[PDB]
Amino acid sequence: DFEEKMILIRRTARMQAGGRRFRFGALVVVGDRQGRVGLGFGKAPEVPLAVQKAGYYARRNMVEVPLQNGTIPHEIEVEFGASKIVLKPAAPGTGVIAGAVPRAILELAGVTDILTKELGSRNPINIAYATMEALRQLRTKADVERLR
RNA sequence: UUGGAGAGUUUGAUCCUGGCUCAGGGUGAACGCUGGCGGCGUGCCUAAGACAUGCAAGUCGUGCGGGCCGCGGG
Ligand SMILES: [Mg+2]
Ligand SMILES: [Mg+2]
Ligand SMILES: [Mg+2]
Ligand SMILES: [Mg+2]
Ligand SMILES: [Mg+2]
Ligand SMILES: [Mg+2]
Ligand SMILES: [Mg+2]
Ligand SMILES: [Mg+2]
Ligand SMILES: [Mg+2]
Ligand SMILES: [Mg+2]
Ligand SMILES: [Mg+2]
Ligand SMILES: [Mg+2]
Ligand SMILES: [Mg+2]
Ligand SMILES: [Mg+2]
Ligand SMILES: [Mg+2]
Ligand SMILES: [Mg+2]
Ligand SMILES: [Mg+2]
Ligand SMILES: [Mg+2]
Ligand SMILES: [Mg+2]
Ligand SMILES: [Mg+2]
Ligand SMILES: [Mg+2]
Ligand SMILES: [Mg+2]
């Protein structure tokens, strides 16, 4: 089994005659701390259901991150909508330098030393998606020469 | 490559834009409450406004001629 971290849990409303009615949403990252992470956004009429549902998708949508001594292979920058994440390789003594959202995802991915920066919109959901699709675009010296 | 964290706030809810605001470090500081010691710093950013009193530039008789006192003695 993997480790789970709930990043975001929010309540949203819809309007009807007689009043608003609610629904909940859960951002959950999932990982083994060895190079496998996944992200899922689960919504349901009560919190624990949504959280569990978030767990499910998190396992369905995974990604393999090419760790190297606990850092990522190259600098990467990715935009998701107006949200932009910046990822930069870092040496042993560094630590994971990131906001709560991208930290959780990187941390569970087995990243131990990295430099990051949130730019543009800092919408937690869009930043989480952006971080994922950034990890998903990480390549290795192997991958590179193999392609070319 | 030794280096980069963000959060609150427009909505019934959403994404975006955008401003405001906060957490950090800094000071020749001041103000409040409080106040035991020591070291190293450091102390009129305002009126280059006005200043009592003392002191902050003198030395040389191995450049010269004297005044006064004094020591030796003609
Ligand atoms: Mg966005
Ligand atoms: Mg854009
Ligand atoms: Mg490297
Ligand atoms: Mg923005
Ligand atoms: Mg914001
Ligand atoms: Mg790969
Ligand atoms: Mg650099
Ligand atoms: Mg910050
Ligand atoms: Mg308001
Ligand atoms: Mg409006
Ligand atoms: Mg409101
Ligand atoms: Mg803002
Ligand atoms: Mg301060
Ligand atoms: Mg005081
Ligand atoms: Mg006092
Ligand atoms: Mg002393
Ligand atoms: Mg002193
Ligand atoms: Mg004065
Ligand atoms: Mg002055
Ligand atoms: Mg005057
Ligand atoms: Mg005057
Ligand atoms: Mg004197």
PDB file of C-alpha atoms (C1' of nucleotides) and ligand atoms in Angstrom:
ATOM      1  CA  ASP A   1       0.000   0.000   0.000  1.00  0.00           C
ATOM      2  CA  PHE A   2       0.925   3.678  -0.575  1.00  0.00           C
ATOM      3  CA  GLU A   3       0.832   6.731   1.684  1.00  0.00           C
ATOM      4  CA  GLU A   4      -2.068   9.213   1.419  1.00  0.00           C
ATOM      5  CA  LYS A   5      -2.171  12.954   2.042  1.00  0.00           C
ATOM      6  CA  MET A   6      -5.312  15.072   1.822  1.00  0.00           C
ATOM      7  CA  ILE A   7      -4.266  18.378   0.304  1.00  0.00           C
ATOM      8  CA  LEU A   8      -7.604  20.116  -0.138  1.00  0.00           C
ATOM      9  CA  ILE A   9     -11.072  19.553   1.279  1.00  0.00           C
ATOM     10  CA  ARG A  10     -13.631  22.212   0.379  1.00  0.00           C
ATOM     11  CA  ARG A  11     -17.364  22.690   0.662  1.00  0.00           C
ATOM     12  CA  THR A  12     -19.239  23.998  -2.367  1.00  0.00           C
ATOM     13  CA  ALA A  13     -22.846  25.080  -2.773  1.00  0.00           C
ATOM     14  CA  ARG A  14     -25.594  24.918  -5.371  1.00  0.00           C
ATOM     15  CA  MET A  15     -28.740  27.036  -5.126  1.00  0.00           C
ATOM     16  CA  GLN A  16     -32.320  25.826  -5.167  1.00  0.00           C
ATOM     17  CA  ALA A  17     -35.644  27.154  -4.039  1.00  0.00           C
ATOM     18  CA  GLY A  18     -35.648  27.044  -0.271  1.00  0.00           C
ATOM     19  CA  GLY A  19     -31.868  27.189  -0.100  1.00  0.00           C
ATOM     20  CA  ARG A  20     -28.328  26.128  -0.794  1.00  0.00           C
ATOM     21  CA  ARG A  21     -27.333  22.472  -0.761  1.00  0.00           C
ATOM     22  CA  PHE A  22     -23.797  21.346  -0.311  1.00  0.00           C
ATOM     23  CA  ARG A  23     -21.252  18.953  -1.754  1.00  0.00           C
ATOM     24  CA  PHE A  24     -17.639  18.338  -0.750  1.00  0.00           C
ATOM     25  CA  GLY A  25     -14.439  17.913  -2.687  1.00  0.00           C
ATOM     26  CA  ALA A  26     -11.161  16.321  -1.739  1.00  0.00           C
ATOM     27  CA  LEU A  27      -7.704  16.630  -3.222  1.00  0.00           C
ATOM     28  CA  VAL A  28      -5.659  13.608  -2.287  1.00  0.00           C
ATOM     29  CA  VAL A  29      -2.144  12.670  -3.288  1.00  0.00           C
ATOM     30  CA  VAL A  30      -0.960   9.084  -2.988  1.00  0.00           C
ATOM     31  CA  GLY A  31       2.559   7.660  -2.994  1.00  0.00           C
ATOM     32  CA  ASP A  32       5.188   5.135  -1.883  1.00  0.00           C
ATOM     33  CA  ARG A  33       8.057   7.633  -1.394  1.00  0.00           C
ATOM     34  CA  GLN A  34      10.023   5.676  -3.989  1.00  0.00           C
ATOM     35  CA  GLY A  35       8.952   7.218  -7.288  1.00  0.00           C
ATOM     36  CA  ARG A  36       5.234   6.571  -7.585  1.00  0.00           C
ATOM     37  CA  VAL A  37       2.672   9.336  -7.017  1.00  0.00           C
ATOM     38  CA  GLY A  38      -0.936   9.841  -8.044  1.00  0.00           C
ATOM     39  CA  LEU A  39      -3.500  12.627  -7.825  1.00  0.00           C
ATOM     40  CA  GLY A  40      -7.247  12.426  -7.549  1.00  0.00           C
ATOM     41  CA  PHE A  41      -9.958  14.938  -6.893  1.00  0.00           C
ATOM     42  CA  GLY A  42     -12.964  13.322  -5.217  1.00  0.00           C
ATOM     43  CA  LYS A  43     -16.372  14.882  -4.641  1.00  0.00           C
ATOM     44  CA  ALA A  44     -19.391  13.499  -2.757  1.00  0.00           C
ATOM     45  CA  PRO A  45     -22.268  14.629  -0.488  1.00  0.00           C
ATOM     46  CA  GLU A  46     -20.212  14.120   2.711  1.00  0.00           C
ATOM     47  CA  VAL A  47     -16.496  14.536   3.524  1.00  0.00           C
ATOM     48  CA  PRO A  48     -15.234  10.984   4.260  1.00  0.00           C
ATOM     49  CA  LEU A  49     -16.911   9.560   1.125  1.00  0.00           C
ATOM     50  CA  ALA A  50     -15.276  12.257  -1.005  1.00  0.00           C
ATOM     51  CA  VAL A  51     -11.923  11.595   0.633  1.00  0.00           C
ATOM     52  CA  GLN A  52     -12.175   7.875  -0.073  1.00  0.00           C
ATOM     53  CA  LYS A  53     -13.323   8.551  -3.646  1.00  0.00           C
ATOM     54  CA  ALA A  54     -10.281  10.832  -4.013  1.00  0.00           C
ATOM     55  CA  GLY A  55      -8.133   7.894  -2.913  1.00  0.00           C
ATOM     56  CA  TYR A  56      -9.565   5.706  -5.659  1.00  0.00           C
ATOM     57  CA  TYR A  57      -8.739   8.053  -8.565  1.00  0.00           C
ATOM     58  CA  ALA A  58      -5.353   8.784  -7.006  1.00  0.00           C
ATOM     59  CA  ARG A  59      -4.467   5.118  -7.489  1.00  0.00           C
ATOM     60  CA  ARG A  60      -5.943   4.962 -10.971  1.00  0.00           C
ATOM     61  CA  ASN A  61      -4.015   8.030 -12.165  1.00  0.00           C
ATOM     62  CA  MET A  62      -0.377   7.526 -11.202  1.00  0.00           C
ATOM     63  CA  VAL A  63       2.966   8.732 -12.526  1.00  0.00           C
ATOM     64  CA  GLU A  64       6.536   7.451 -12.370  1.00  0.00           C
ATOM     65  CA  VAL A  65       9.019  10.077 -11.304  1.00  0.00           C
ATOM     66  CA  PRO A  66      12.697   9.409 -12.184  1.00  0.00           C
ATOM     67  CA  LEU A  67      14.343  10.165  -8.835  1.00  0.00           C
ATOM     68  CA  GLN A  68      18.129  10.618  -8.758  1.00  0.00           C
ATOM     69  CA  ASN A  69      19.695  10.715  -5.292  1.00  0.00           C
ATOM     70  CA  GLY A  70      16.394  12.228  -4.175  1.00  0.00           C
ATOM     71  CA  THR A  71      16.033  15.037  -6.717  1.00  0.00           C
ATOM     72  CA  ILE A  72      14.545  15.374 -10.190  1.00  0.00           C
ATOM     73  CA  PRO A  73      16.740  14.961 -13.300  1.00  0.00           C
ATOM     74  CA  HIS A  74      16.309  18.428 -14.882  1.00  0.00           C
ATOM     75  CA  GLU A  75      14.679  21.839 -14.451  1.00  0.00           C
ATOM     76  CA  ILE A  76      11.049  21.770 -15.532  1.00  0.00           C
ATOM     77  CA  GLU A  77       8.320  24.431 -15.794  1.00  0.00           C
ATOM     78  CA  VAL A  78       4.695  23.707 -16.594  1.00  0.00           C
ATOM     79  CA  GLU A  79       1.571  25.818 -17.036  1.00  0.00           C
ATOM     80  CA  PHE A  80      -1.878  24.486 -16.252  1.00  0.00           C
ATOM     81  CA  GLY A  81      -4.359  27.229 -17.128  1.00  0.00           C
ATOM     82  CA  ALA A  82      -3.113  30.344 -15.316  1.00  0.00           C
ATOM     83  CA  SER A  83      -1.191  28.266 -12.819  1.00  0.00           C
ATOM     84  CA  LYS A  84       2.502  27.739 -13.359  1.00  0.00           C
ATOM     85  CA  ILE A  85       4.890  25.548 -11.388  1.00  0.00           C
ATOM     86  CA  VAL A  86       8.667  25.807 -11.424  1.00  0.00           C
ATOM     87  CA  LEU A  87      10.814  22.800 -10.481  1.00  0.00           C
ATOM     88  CA  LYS A  88      14.575  22.848 -10.046  1.00  0.00           C
ATOM     89  CA  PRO A  89      17.056  20.053  -9.107  1.00  0.00           C
ATOM     90  CA  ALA A  90      18.715  20.446  -5.685  1.00  0.00           C
ATOM     91  CA  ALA A  91      21.638  18.888  -3.787  1.00  0.00           C
ATOM     92  CA  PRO A  92      21.506  16.671  -0.617  1.00  0.00           C
ATOM     93  CA  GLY A  93      21.482  19.384   2.099  1.00  0.00           C
ATOM     94  CA  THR A  94      18.624  21.282   0.509  1.00  0.00           C
ATOM     95  CA  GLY A  95      15.259  19.845   1.513  1.00  0.00           C
ATOM     96  CA  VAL A  96      11.945  20.192  -0.296  1.00  0.00           C
ATOM     97  CA  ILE A  97      11.357  23.907  -0.847  1.00  0.00           C
ATOM     98  CA  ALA A  98       7.722  24.227  -1.848  1.00  0.00           C
ATOM     99  CA  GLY A  99       4.289  25.398  -0.795  1.00  0.00           C
ATOM    100  CA  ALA A 100       1.945  22.938   0.920  1.00  0.00           C
ATOM    101  CA  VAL A 101       0.342  21.731  -2.328  1.00  0.00           C
ATOM    102  CA  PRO A 102       3.356  20.921  -4.482  1.00  0.00           C
ATOM    103  CA  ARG A 103       5.319  19.796  -1.397  1.00  0.00           C
ATOM    104  CA  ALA A 104       2.869  17.015  -0.551  1.00  0.00           C
ATOM    105  CA  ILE A 105       2.938  15.670  -4.109  1.00  0.00           C
ATOM    106  CA  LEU A 106       6.712  15.841  -4.389  1.00  0.00           C
ATOM    107  CA  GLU A 107       7.264  14.513  -0.858  1.00  0.00           C
ATOM    108  CA  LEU A 108       5.161  11.350  -1.395  1.00  0.00           C
ATOM    109  CA  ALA A 109       6.984  10.946  -4.719  1.00  0.00           C
ATOM    110  CA  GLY A 110      10.224  10.325  -2.858  1.00  0.00           C
ATOM    111  CA  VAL A 111      11.712  13.715  -3.678  1.00  0.00           C
ATOM    112  CA  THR A 112      13.917  14.850  -0.847  1.00  0.00           C
ATOM    113  CA  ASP A 113      15.799  17.874  -2.218  1.00  0.00           C
ATOM    114  CA  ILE A 114      14.158  20.293  -4.659  1.00  0.00           C
ATOM    115  CA  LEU A 115      13.607  23.978  -5.439  1.00  0.00           C
ATOM    116  CA  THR A 116      10.141  25.146  -6.508  1.00  0.00           C
ATOM    117  CA  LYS A 117       8.042  28.227  -7.198  1.00  0.00           C
ATOM    118  CA  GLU A 118       4.365  28.840  -7.760  1.00  0.00           C
ATOM    119  CA  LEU A 119       3.662  31.525 -10.374  1.00  0.00           C
ATOM    120  CA  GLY A 120       0.496  32.845 -11.965  1.00  0.00           C
ATOM    121  CA  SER A 121      -2.689  31.602 -10.332  1.00  0.00           C
ATOM    122  CA  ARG A 122      -2.077  29.771  -7.077  1.00  0.00           C
ATOM    123  CA  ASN A 123      -5.367  27.855  -7.189  1.00  0.00           C
ATOM    124  CA  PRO A 124      -4.492  24.684  -5.187  1.00  0.00           C
ATOM    125  CA  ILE A 125      -6.242  22.339  -7.614  1.00  0.00           C
ATOM    126  CA  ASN A 126      -4.700  23.833 -10.739  1.00  0.00           C
ATOM    127  CA  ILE A 127      -1.283  23.954  -9.054  1.00  0.00           C
ATOM    128  CA  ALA A 128      -1.567  20.311  -8.015  1.00  0.00           C
ATOM    129  CA  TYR A 129      -2.472  19.280 -11.587  1.00  0.00           C
ATOM    130  CA  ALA A 130       0.409  21.376 -12.916  1.00  0.00           C
ATOM    131  CA  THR A 131       2.916  19.745 -10.579  1.00  0.00           C
ATOM    132  CA  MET A 132       1.775  16.311 -11.713  1.00  0.00           C
ATOM    133  CA  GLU A 133       2.020  17.058 -15.425  1.00  0.00           C
ATOM    134  CA  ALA A 134       5.484  18.482 -14.670  1.00  0.00           C
ATOM    135  CA  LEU A 135       6.680  15.279 -13.009  1.00  0.00           C
ATOM    136  CA  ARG A 136       5.090  13.436 -15.926  1.00  0.00           C
ATOM    137  CA  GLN A 137       7.412  15.327 -18.306  1.00  0.00           C
ATOM    138  CA  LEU A 138      10.631  14.473 -16.462  1.00  0.00           C
ATOM    139  CA  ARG A 139      13.146  12.547 -18.582  1.00  0.00           C
ATOM    140  CA  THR A 140      16.486  10.820 -17.965  1.00  0.00           C
ATOM    141  CA  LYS A 141      19.821  10.822 -19.775  1.00  0.00           C
ATOM    142  CA  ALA A 142      18.706   7.358 -20.812  1.00  0.00           C
ATOM    143  CA  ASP A 143      15.315   8.531 -22.123  1.00  0.00           C
ATOM    144  CA  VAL A 144      16.955  11.387 -23.947  1.00  0.00           C
ATOM    145  CA  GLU A 145      19.525   9.480 -25.992  1.00  0.00           C
ATOM    146  CA  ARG A 146      17.036   6.672 -26.471  1.00  0.00           C
ATOM    147  CA  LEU A 147      14.664   9.092 -28.182  1.00  0.00           C
ATOM    148  CA  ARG A 148      17.485  10.593 -30.220  1.00  0.00           C
TER     149      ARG A 148
ATOM    150  C1'   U B   1      24.767  25.075 -10.460  1.00  0.00           C
ATOM    151  C1'   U B   2      24.503  25.058  -2.291  1.00  0.00           C
ATOM    152  C1'   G B   3      19.774  28.566  -4.865  1.00  0.00           C
ATOM    153  C1'   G B   4      13.571  30.188  -5.357  1.00  0.00           C
ATOM    154  C1'   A B   5       7.314  27.813   0.128  1.00  0.00           C
ATOM    155  C1'   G B   6       3.232  31.242   0.563  1.00  0.00           C
ATOM    156  C1'   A B   7      -1.539  32.676   3.106  1.00  0.00           C
ATOM    157  C1'   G B   8      -6.386  36.033   4.116  1.00  0.00           C
ATOM    158  C1'   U B   9      -9.833  38.971   1.444  1.00  0.00           C
ATOM    159  C1'   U B  10     -14.773  40.321  -4.476  1.00  0.00           C
ATOM    160  C1'   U B  11     -19.020  34.681  -5.127  1.00  0.00           C
ATOM    161  C1'   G B  12     -24.711  31.075  -2.965  1.00  0.00           C
ATOM    162  C1'   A B  13     -20.758  28.265  -5.160  1.00  0.00           C
ATOM    163  C1'   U B  14     -16.628  28.399  -9.576  1.00  0.00           C
ATOM    164  C1'   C B  15     -12.434  29.654 -12.554  1.00  0.00           C
ATOM    165  C1'   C B  16      -9.851  34.000 -13.856  1.00  0.00           C
ATOM    166  C1'   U B  17      -8.269  39.072 -13.429  1.00  0.00           C
ATOM    167  C1'   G B  18      -6.846  42.569  -9.770  1.00  0.00           C
ATOM    168  C1'   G B  19      -5.838  45.555  -5.778  1.00  0.00           C
ATOM    169  C1'   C B  20      -5.530  45.653  -0.447  1.00  0.00           C
ATOM    170  C1'   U B  21      -3.433  42.899   3.822  1.00  0.00           C
ATOM    171  C1'   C B  22      -0.163  39.467   6.660  1.00  0.00           C
ATOM    172  C1'   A B  23       3.798  36.060   8.199  1.00  0.00           C
ATOM    173  C1'   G B  24      10.491  37.386   7.029  1.00  0.00           C
ATOM    174  C1'   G B  25      14.921  40.245   7.438  1.00  0.00           C
ATOM    175  C1'   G B  26      16.938  45.243   8.358  1.00  0.00           C
ATOM    176  C1'   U B  27      17.585  50.447  11.597  1.00  0.00           C
ATOM    177  C1'   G B  28      22.411  55.888  14.192  1.00  0.00           C
ATOM    178  C1'   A B  29      15.676  54.724  15.848  1.00  0.00           C
ATOM    179  C1'   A B  30      11.797  56.562  18.934  1.00  0.00           C
ATOM    180  C1'   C B  31       7.207  55.250  22.394  1.00  0.00           C
ATOM    181  C1'   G B  32       4.787  51.899  26.109  1.00  0.00           C
ATOM    182  C1'   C B  33       5.365  48.019  29.967  1.00  0.00           C
ATOM    183  C1'   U B  34       9.512  45.960  32.347  1.00  0.00           C
ATOM    184  C1'   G B  35      14.564  45.981  33.725  1.00  0.00           C
ATOM    185  C1'   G B  36      20.336  42.161  37.215  1.00  0.00           C
ATOM    186  C1'   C B  37      25.459  41.881  35.295  1.00  0.00           C
ATOM    187  C1'   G B  38      29.571  42.139  31.523  1.00  0.00           C
ATOM    188  C1'   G B  39      32.189  42.761  26.934  1.00  0.00           C
ATOM    189  C1'   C B  40      32.489  45.068  22.006  1.00  0.00           C
ATOM    190  C1'   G B  41      30.221  48.660  19.314  1.00  0.00           C
ATOM    191  C1'   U B  42      27.451  52.915  19.193  1.00  0.00           C
ATOM    192  C1'   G B  43      24.542  57.763  20.352  1.00  0.00           C
ATOM    193  C1'   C B  44      21.391  65.749  17.435  1.00  0.00           C
ATOM    194  C1'   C B  45      19.134  62.023  10.705  1.00  0.00           C
ATOM    195  C1'   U B  46      15.446  68.190  13.636  1.00  0.00           C
ATOM    196  C1'   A B  47      17.658  74.572  13.637  1.00  0.00           C
ATOM    197  C1'   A B  48      24.798  74.529   8.558  1.00  0.00           C
ATOM    198  C1'   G B  49      19.543  77.822  14.809  1.00  0.00           C
ATOM    199  C1'   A B  50      21.849  80.704  18.791  1.00  0.00           C
ATOM    200  C1'   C B  51      25.955  79.924  22.401  1.00  0.00           C
ATOM    201  C1'   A B  52      28.162  81.395  29.013  1.00  0.00           C
ATOM    202  C1'   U B  53      33.182  78.982  30.751  1.00  0.00           C
ATOM    203  C1'   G B  54      37.650  76.019  30.160  1.00  0.00           C
ATOM    204  C1'   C B  55      40.495  73.507  26.770  1.00  0.00           C
ATOM    205  C1'   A B  56      41.373  71.744  21.087  1.00  0.00           C
ATOM    206  C1'   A B  57      49.030  74.474  18.177  1.00  0.00           C
ATOM    207  C1'   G B  58      52.997  75.128  19.362  1.00  0.00           C
ATOM    208  C1'   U B  59      58.128  74.681  19.731  1.00  0.00           C
ATOM    209  C1'   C B  60      63.486  76.130  19.266  1.00  0.00           C
ATOM    210  C1'   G B  61      68.686  79.882  24.018  1.00  0.00           C
ATOM    211  C1'   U B  62      72.841  74.510  19.541  1.00  0.00           C
ATOM    212  C1'   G B  63      69.712  81.678  15.103  1.00  0.00           C
ATOM    213  C1'   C B  64      69.919  87.100  18.184  1.00  0.00           C
ATOM    214  C1'   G B  65      69.892  91.155  21.372  1.00  0.00           C
ATOM    215  C1'   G B  66      67.628  92.365  26.130  1.00  0.00           C
ATOM    216  C1'   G B  67      64.207  92.943  30.846  1.00  0.00           C
ATOM    217  C1'   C B  68      63.334  90.502  35.883  1.00  0.00           C
ATOM    218  C1'   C B  69      64.684  87.024  39.696  1.00  0.00           C
ATOM    219  C1'   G B  70      68.375  83.444  41.115  1.00  0.00           C
ATOM    220  C1'   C B  71      72.891  80.367  41.776  1.00  0.00           C
ATOM    221  C1'   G B  72      78.367  80.348  41.677  1.00  0.00           C
ATOM    222  C1'   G B  73      82.441  84.772  42.317  1.00  0.00           C
ATOM    223  C1'   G B  74      85.289  89.730  40.254  1.00  0.00           C
TER     224        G B  74
HETATM  225 MG    MG C   1      -4.987  28.070 -13.420  1.00  0.00          MG
HETATM  226 MG    MG C   2      -1.406  32.010 -19.619  1.00  0.00          MG
HETATM  227 MG    MG C   3      21.496  17.703 -10.694  1.00  0.00          MG
HETATM  228 MG    MG C   4      -2.389  35.706 -10.224  1.00  0.00          MG
HETATM  229 MG    MG C   5      -5.384  34.033  -3.293  1.00  0.00          MG
HETATM  230 MG    MG C   6      10.384   8.272 -17.159  1.00  0.00          MG
HETATM  231 MG    MG C   7      21.178  28.280 -10.617  1.00  0.00          MG
HETATM  232 MG    MG C   8       7.114  33.384   0.844  1.00  0.00          MG
HETATM  233 MG    MG C   9     -15.068  40.282   2.394  1.00  0.00          MG
HETATM  234 MG    MG C  10     -18.527  41.023  -8.501  1.00  0.00          MG
HETATM  235 MG    MG C  11     -19.236  35.522   1.705  1.00  0.00          MG
HETATM  236 MG    MG C  12      -4.900  38.034  -4.216  1.00  0.00          MG
HETATM  237 MG    MG C  13       9.771  43.728  10.731  1.00  0.00          MG
HETATM  238 MG    MG C  14      12.114  51.901  25.834  1.00  0.00          MG
HETATM  239 MG    MG C  15      11.761  53.285  33.269  1.00  0.00          MG
HETATM  240 MG    MG C  16      36.341  47.891  29.293  1.00  0.00          MG
HETATM  241 MG    MG C  17      30.201  51.443  26.752  1.00  0.00          MG
HETATM  242 MG    MG C  18      22.150  71.695  17.658  1.00  0.00          MG
HETATM  243 MG    MG C  19      23.777  67.566  11.556  1.00  0.00          MG
HETATM  244 MG    MG C  20      16.225  79.572  12.788  1.00  0.00          MG
HETATM  245 MG    MG C  21      17.134  80.983  18.497  1.00  0.00          MG
HETATM  246 MG    MG C  22      45.116  71.253  28.088  1.00  0.00          MG
END
